[PDB]
Amino acid sequence: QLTEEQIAEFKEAFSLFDKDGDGTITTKELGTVMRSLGQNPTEAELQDMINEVDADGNGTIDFPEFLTMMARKMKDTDSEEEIREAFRVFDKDGNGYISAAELRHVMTNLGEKLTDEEVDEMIREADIDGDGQVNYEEFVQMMTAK
């Protein structure tokens, strides 16, 4: 029951990291993405991140190893502390609502080239109440519900 939709989504996420498109994610590529989000992982942390999933021992992450990384993380995310941390990454002005403009800004900072329509689509997918924004409860639902 893996869908074509889920695969395309994983593919988009992989390509966010794989900025040179060589089909592998290196420590440098992980470092660049986490730094674009205001984090500062050390070389050792980056190596440990790859090591957790590096099935062939080659020092980089390929597609199925990236899928493994994501699946582990989905399973590991129930804590309000982790989810609230992710929420604040997107709720730039801290007003408790992720707007289409805030999501556009974060996507741009990540290097993801998305149309205005694609960003509105993302807000619509997570918006439950229909106010046109994403509140914390809606963000939780998006993260824990699948």
Binding site: M34, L37, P41, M70, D76, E112, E118, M122, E125
Partner: peptide
Amino acid sequence: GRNWKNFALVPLLRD
């Protein structure tokens, strides 16, 4: 209608 969950998880990868 476009699921964004994988992006929202990225800040949590560091765990």
